[PDB]
């Protein structure tokens, strides 16, 4: 009998689709994470971060959740907070989308908006103040450094990919925001299954901090339009040691690639899915990768 006790338990088992207008003779397959509650890959970590905090007893009846995300992690936490009966406060910099605002209010989130100018620094700041005022009350889950983020990917996303490809996956390409996706997936296939694949992280050309880091060059972040990736620093949840390769992609090409997936494949993907596919396309068209099954994470749906 396959009935989930709440929405949180329904995460994952997302599908593999072969691309027709990218790669070479169907060597690029996409994993659609838009097929999830809250409609993004962050549904996995929203659930496991709450579940682990429960199991270890940092989260109980009585304790509220506070955190600073201005992206899909807010939505993910919102749905899980709702599904499991927790109050949630989210901080974010006021120059956020009414649509995002409205959706979060709908999900029953307490919204604390911070000055536009001051951005995520502002929102993070104000979140820590709020914890600081009542430590026994609020718990912060911290998506950038919480090992329950990559762990879920090791337990679900990675195995799904292995199972659905009958052990044939040769390459995995994934944009990096918190790094959790590529980390967990890589640990699972390399360490748990024992296959030496090529792990490919993707970042905006506008803010190529992983690339500059590994090349021992000056880290120089910048603004970009590829929502979901390009944090402008290395997160703790990115295990550099499992990253075989790093591909950079520009905003315009990531957007266009997105529009192409829509128009040509009938795949409703977000901008970072566009960035991930652009990178994968590039490797798929090198002779060294021609006979290699390449799996790309599509993190979200449109917008």
């Amino acid at each position: 009998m396959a009935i989930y006790a709440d929405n949180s338990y329904s995460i994952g088992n997302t599908p593999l689709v072969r691309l027709k207008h990218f790669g070479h003779n169907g060597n690029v397959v996409v994993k659609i994470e838009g097929r999830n509650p809250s409609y993004s890959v962050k549904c996995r970590i929203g659930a496991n971060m709450v579940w682990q905090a429960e199991k270890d007893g940092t989260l109980t009846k009585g304790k509220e959740i506070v955190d600073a995300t201005s992206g899909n992690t807010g939505i993910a936490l919102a749905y899980v907070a709702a599904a499991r009966g927790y109050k949630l406060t989210l901080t974010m910099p006021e120059t956020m989308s009414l649509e995002r605002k409205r959706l979060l209010c709908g999900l029953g989130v307490n919204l604390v908006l911070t000055e536009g100018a001051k951005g995520m620094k502002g929102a993070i700041a104000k979140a820590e103040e709020i914890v600081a005022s009542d430590p026994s009350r609020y718990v912060m889950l911290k998506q950038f450094e919480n090992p329950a983020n990559p762990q879920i990917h090791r337990e679900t996303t990675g195995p799904e990919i292995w199972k659905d490809t009958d052990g044939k996956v040769d390459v995995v390409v994934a944009g990096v925001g918190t790094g959790g996706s590529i980390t967990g997936i890589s640990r699972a296939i390399k360490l748990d299954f024992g296959k030496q694949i090529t792990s490919v992280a993707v970042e905006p050309v506008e803010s190529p901090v992983i690339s500059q880091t590994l090349a021992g060059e000056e880290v120089k972040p910048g603004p970009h339009k590829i929502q979901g990736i390009g944090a402008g620093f290395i997160p703790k949840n990115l295990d550099l040691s499992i990253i075989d390769r790093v591909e950079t992609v520009d905003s315009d090409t990531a957007l266009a690639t997105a529009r192409r997936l829509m128009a040509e494949e009938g795949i409703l993907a977000g901008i970072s899915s566009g960035a991930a596919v652009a990178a994968a396309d590039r490797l798929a068209k090198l002779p060294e990768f021609a006979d290699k099954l390449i799996v790309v994470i599509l993190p979200s749906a449109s917008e």
Binding site: S70, M120, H224, G230, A231
Partner: peptide, 8 residues
């Protein structure tokens, strides 16, 4: 993730 530090 919208900004880690910077998105537009």
């Amino acid at each position: 993730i919208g900004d880690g530090y910077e998105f537009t």
